[PDB]
Design an enzyme around this catalytic site. Structure first.
Site, PDB file in Angstrom:
ATOM      1  N   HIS A   1       0.806  -1.223   0.000  1.00  0.00           N
ATOM      2  CA  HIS A   1       0.000   0.000   0.000  1.00  0.00           C
ATOM      3  C   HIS A   1       0.848   1.288   0.000  1.00  0.00           C
ATOM      4  CE1 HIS A   1       0.250   0.979   4.298  1.00  0.00           C
ATOM      5  NE2 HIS A   1      -0.097  -0.268   4.617  1.00  0.00           N
TER       6      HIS A   1
ATOM      7  N   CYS B   1       3.411   1.192   9.684  1.00  0.00           N
ATOM      8  CA  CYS B   1       3.262   0.179   8.624  1.00  0.00           C
ATOM      9  C   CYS B   1       4.619  -0.277   8.145  1.00  0.00           C
ATOM     10  CB  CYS B   1       2.425   0.716   7.468  1.00  0.00           C
ATOM     11  SG  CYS B   1       0.788   1.320   7.950  1.00  0.00           S
TER      12      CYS B   1
ATOM     13  N   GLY C   1       2.340   5.663  10.372  1.00  0.00           N
ATOM     14  CA  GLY C   1       3.755   5.554  10.049  1.00  0.00           C
ATOM     15  C   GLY C   1       4.389   4.250  10.507  1.00  0.00           C
TER      16      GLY C   1
HETATM   17  O1  LIG Z   1      -4.414   2.414   8.735  1.00  0.00           O
HETATM   18  C1  LIG Z   1      -3.269   2.560   8.315  1.00  0.00           C
HETATM   19  N1  LIG Z   1      -2.169   2.278   9.048  1.00  0.00           N
HETATM   20  C2  LIG Z   1      -1.923   2.409  10.433  1.00  0.00           C
HETATM   21  C3  LIG Z   1      -1.261   1.403  11.132  1.00  0.00           C
HETATM   22  N2  LIG Z   1      -1.248   1.257  12.462  1.00  0.00           N
HETATM   23  C4  LIG Z   1      -1.894   2.159  13.180  1.00  0.00           C
HETATM   24  C5  LIG Z   1      -2.572   3.273  12.634  1.00  0.00           C
HETATM   25  C6  LIG Z   1      -3.127   4.303  13.436  1.00  0.00           C
HETATM   26  C7  LIG Z   1      -3.647   5.425  12.860  1.00  0.00           C
HETATM   27  C8  LIG Z   1      -3.646   5.579  11.484  1.00  0.00           C
HETATM   28  C9  LIG Z   1      -3.138   4.604  10.674  1.00  0.00           C
HETATM   29  C10 LIG Z   1      -2.589   3.411  11.217  1.00  0.00           C
HETATM   30  C11 LIG Z   1      -2.980   2.963   6.868  1.00  0.00           C
HETATM   31  C12 LIG Z   1      -3.132   4.480   6.647  1.00  0.00           C
HETATM   32  C13 LIG Z   1      -4.588   4.926   6.797  1.00  0.00           C
HETATM   33  N3  LIG Z   1      -5.502   4.111   5.989  1.00  0.00           N
HETATM   34  C14 LIG Z   1      -6.779   4.717   5.653  1.00  0.00           C
HETATM   35  C15 LIG Z   1      -6.780   5.377   4.311  1.00  0.00           C
HETATM   36  N4  LIG Z   1      -7.849   5.846   3.668  1.00  0.00           N
HETATM   37  N5  LIG Z   1      -7.467   6.395   2.476  1.00  0.00           N
HETATM   38  C16 LIG Z   1      -6.162   6.234   2.447  1.00  0.00           C
HETATM   39  N6  LIG Z   1      -5.649   5.611   3.540  1.00  0.00           N
HETATM   40  C17 LIG Z   1      -5.205   2.733   5.677  1.00  0.00           C
HETATM   41  C18 LIG Z   1      -6.146   1.970   4.990  1.00  0.00           C
HETATM   42  C19 LIG Z   1      -5.816   0.695   4.561  1.00  0.00           C
HETATM   43  C20 LIG Z   1      -4.551   0.207   4.804  1.00  0.00           C
HETATM   44 CL1  LIG Z   1      -4.097  -1.346   4.157  1.00  0.00          CL
HETATM   45  C21 LIG Z   1      -3.617   0.933   5.513  1.00  0.00           C
HETATM   46  C22 LIG Z   1      -3.943   2.203   5.980  1.00  0.00           C
END
Ligand SMILES: O=C(Nc1cncc2ccccc12)[C@@H]1CCN(Cc2nnc[nH]2)c2ccc(Cl)cc21
Ligand SMILES: O=C(Nc1cncc2ccccc12)[C@@H]1CCN(Cc2nnc[nH]2)c2ccc(Cl)cc21
Ligand SMILES: [Cl-]
EC number: 3.4.19.12
Lengths: 300, 305
Positions: free
Chosen positions: B41, B145, B143
């Site tokens: 991603h 990921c 961040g």
């Molecule tokens: O959720 C994620 N990673 C994160 C990891 N660990 C803890 C978090 C705590 C707060 C925020 C993000 C966190 C990322 C980034 C955010 N977004 C949501 C999205 N919607 N539009 C574009 N990206 C998504 C959506 C899907 C996936 Cl695979 C990955 C991701």
């Protein structure tokens, strides 16, 4: 989101762990530059142990009595000196993996990571707090002596603890890296007991702010309290008094969540009075006191 | 004495953490030999995530679109390929700190250490279990990921997890190092919910043996149970079924403490139907399920890495 008990990455400390052997005793040493630091009790013959004269025992030792092993390489000891309860073995090789480091003495309530070692080999890393009674509730077996407690200052390792002994209740006692014990403890087999432990109140409040940041609000109430009224209640539950310093330290979390310190203090009073009623806070059924305000802000 | 949630020493994994930047997204990569592994991603913007065609997005990328940074040194990407949900960036330089390693897929209930990273810099290490619902109750911010989950086998790092996302309930979802997700999750911004979680029964039993080894015996009782009667009671409290494999795995702890597995199950059965009654086990008022039987033996015996 989420909240975990989290240790610092132990890599910079692993590169410093060595095995120190003196006669029949083998424990861990911390090799920084051309010096290996370890508990001075490595020179004891479990007969000296009750009332040892460490100056007298160390004077009878030579550099060839200490066997220092870094991995599969034996280090040559070229000097030995004692600073309080720590033995300093000067070696003829500076540790090439020596990180940026500093020796810091911490206060009760402060947290740190422990790199548990046996025979100079790291086996685990966990998170501790210096208990108000100056002990640490560690997880240590025989041979763990010399294991260190540390924090990482964004590139710099602050060494704050060296494990020396286990008290009759299973709690642990040790020193800073300058050999000064935390607490009224001595490195002898004399009858020693830790004082009655208490809960680190400022840390519980910090952890309640972590729960609010994570969306847990069930324990919040419409009450506030005076600092004195809170301390009168908290102390009846074996909680440490909360000072004005602690209130000030909780300021950023108070501003971030919109919940005043004395407002959160009233939530704490209520939890102590009622218990949890089958509910949990951050997946815990007990109030957690091993996260400082600095830890909460860093993790959240 | 003492019992702590303990992670493996993270040193061997720290030497592998790098920062991967693709356009506006920055996350972590795992640099092993001449390849950097990271969540696919990273090639996506906020629009792609809604419904991304990762083959189509990656085909439009060139090696110079990926900025890989190992400490203060920029690594030169000479190839890019995708294996399931992981992106593999071939680099010109083999990581000199590459440890003995292996990619392993773990089962629910198994524990592992997480090295949480931000901008290719490790900031914390914690121990967690792969929940029966395939999520991990982690601690991750934006961040994180690309941060990895691992175990250490003698001197070999077994990489088992790469963090990809956070679910609406704050729990986390990720993949093995071959890009295969743990659980019914996808790497897209879509409505996804974790299944109802259950308690890892074998781990609770392992943790009860750790309490006995540490001197906490109040919960022990004279009773034993059949495996079937225990599972009927456990299924009712959202506890995972205990198999004969689990009983066998608890054998060494059973022998060490003199408490048969079905004898400990009768204690667990009572704890479930009656509670703790104001008492704690190992300083906890809840039954802890994130210590496997191997973790307990390792901690209560001092196995080093
Ligand atoms: O959720 C994620 N990673 C994160 C990891 N660990 C803890 C978090 C705590 C707060 C925020 C993000 C966190 C990322 C980034 C955010 N977004 C949501 C999205 N919607 N539009 C574009 N990206 C998504 C959506 C899907 C996936 Cl695979 C990955 C991701
Ligand atoms: O207690 C120590 N270290 C250990 C560390 N962590 C956890 C342990 C768990 C089980 C056993 C030992 C543990 C050592 C060695 C043993 N004994 C106790 C003693 N000294 N003579 C007679 N008995 C003492 C006594 C004093 C001092 Cl400074 C150090 C020590
Ligand atoms: Cl086993």
């Amino acid at each position: 989101s989420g909240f975990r008990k989290m240790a610092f990455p132990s890599g910079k400390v692993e590169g410093c762990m060595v095995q120190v052997t003196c006669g029949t005793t083998t424990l861990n040493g911390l090799w920084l530059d051309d010096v290996v630091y370890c508990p001075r009790h490595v020179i004891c013959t479990s007969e000296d142990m009750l009332n040892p004269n460490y100056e007298d025992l160390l004077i009878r030792k030579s550099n060839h009595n200490f066997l220092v092993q870094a991995g599969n390489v034996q280090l040559r000891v070229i000097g030995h000196s004692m600073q309080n309860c720590v033995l300093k073995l000067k070696v003829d090789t500076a540790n090439p993996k020596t990180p940026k480091y500093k020796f810091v003495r911490i206060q009760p309530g402060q947290t740190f990571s422990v790199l548990a070692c046996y025979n100079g080999s790291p086996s685990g890393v966990y998170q501790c707090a210096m208990r108000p009674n100056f002990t640490i509730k560690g997880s240590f077996l025989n041979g763990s002596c010399g294991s260190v407690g540390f924090n990482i200052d964004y590139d710099c390792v602050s060494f704050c603890y060296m494990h020396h002994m286990e008290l009759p209740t299973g709690v642990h006692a040790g020193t800073d890296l300058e050999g000064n014990f935390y607490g009224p403890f001595v490195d002898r087999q004399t009858a020693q007991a830790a004082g009655t432990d208490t809960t680190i109140t400022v840390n519980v409040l910090a952890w309640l702010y972590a729960a609010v940041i994570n969306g847990d609000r069930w324990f919040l109430n419409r009450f506030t309290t005076t600092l004195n009224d809170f301390n009168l209640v908290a102390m009846k539950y074996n909680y440490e008094p909360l000072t004005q310093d602690h209130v000030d330290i909780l300021g950023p979390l108070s501003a971030q969540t919109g919940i005043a310190v004395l407002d959160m203090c009233a939530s704490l009073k209520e939890l102590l009075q009622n218990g949890m009623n089958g509910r949990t806070i951050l997946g815990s059924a007990l109030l957690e006191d091993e996260f400082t305000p600095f830890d909460v802000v860093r993790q959240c």
